[model samples]
Target: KSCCRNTLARNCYNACRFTGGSQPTCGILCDCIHVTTTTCPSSHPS
Candidate 1:
């Protein structure tokens, strides 16, 4: 159930890193990985 999706920011990702390496989001290519514990990066496709 992937529901976090918004105009992600590059810095947001840098600020916060998850598990997934590359899945899908509003990044350079609408892709983001999966991370547990730390909140998904605001820059990442949460």
Candidate 2:
């Protein structure tokens, strides 16, 4: 779990991937706290 791993981006990416189809994909290490809703797309990942 990226949350426990202390890597929000990793967590989010995993979540998105799991959900599948036009999800978000983040890097290894990223500040999920700072990455607000506006920062990430709701439909697609990048």
Candidate 3:
């Protein structure tokens, strides 16, 4: 599974409504792409 997230210190300011301060940023997931495959003999994985 691959996910695209937005990790920016500036974004955290808006999210927390912060004005100023050096704080660690957090990851905000925008979207994700998940690929599930089966390991069956008859399946394509064979």
Candidate 4:
């Protein structure tokens, strides 16, 4: 899994995508700390 569960933005999405899903989709933009929450990360590119 992912280290983030919050709503990830474009910057985060791009960053996550570049890492091939190995990195957090939020990229520090969100407060998700590897917890399972209702909020999910966005895969949309910048």
lDDT of 4 by residue, 1-36 (tens): 344433354446456667656445454554334435
**Each model's TM-score, in the order given?**
0.24, 0.31, 0.22, 0.28
Model 3 segments beyond 4 Å from truth?
1-7, 18-46
Q: Residue-wise lDDT of candidate 3 within 2-39, one digit each (tens)?
A: 22233342254345435333223212222222225332
Give me the candidate number with maximum TM-score: 2
lDDT of all predictions = 0.43, 0.39, 0.30, 0.45
Model 4, residue 46: C-alpha shift (Å): 8.1
Model 2 global lDDT (CA atoms, 0 to 1): 0.39
lDDT score at residue 18, model 3, on the 0-100 scale = 58
Alpha-carbon error at 35 in model 3, in Å? 46
User: Per the 3 Å backbone cut-off, how many clashing residue pairs does candidate 4 have?
Assistant: 0
TM-score of 1: 0.24
Instruction: Note the clash tally of each candidate.
Output: 11, 2, 0, 0
Q: Flag regions of model 2 displaced more than 4 Å.
A: 1-6, 22-46
The TM-score measured for candidate 2 stands at 0.31
RMSD of each: 9.9, 10.4, 13.1, 7.1
Summing lDDT over every window of 10 consecutive residues in candidate 4, give the lowest-scoring window. Answer: 37-46
What TM-score does model 4 achieve against the real structure?
Answer: 0.28
Strongest candidate by lDDT: 4
Ranking of candidates on TM-score, top first: 2, 4, 1, 3
Candidate 1 residue-wise lDDT, 1-46, digit = tens: 2323453544444434353534343233434445563675554445
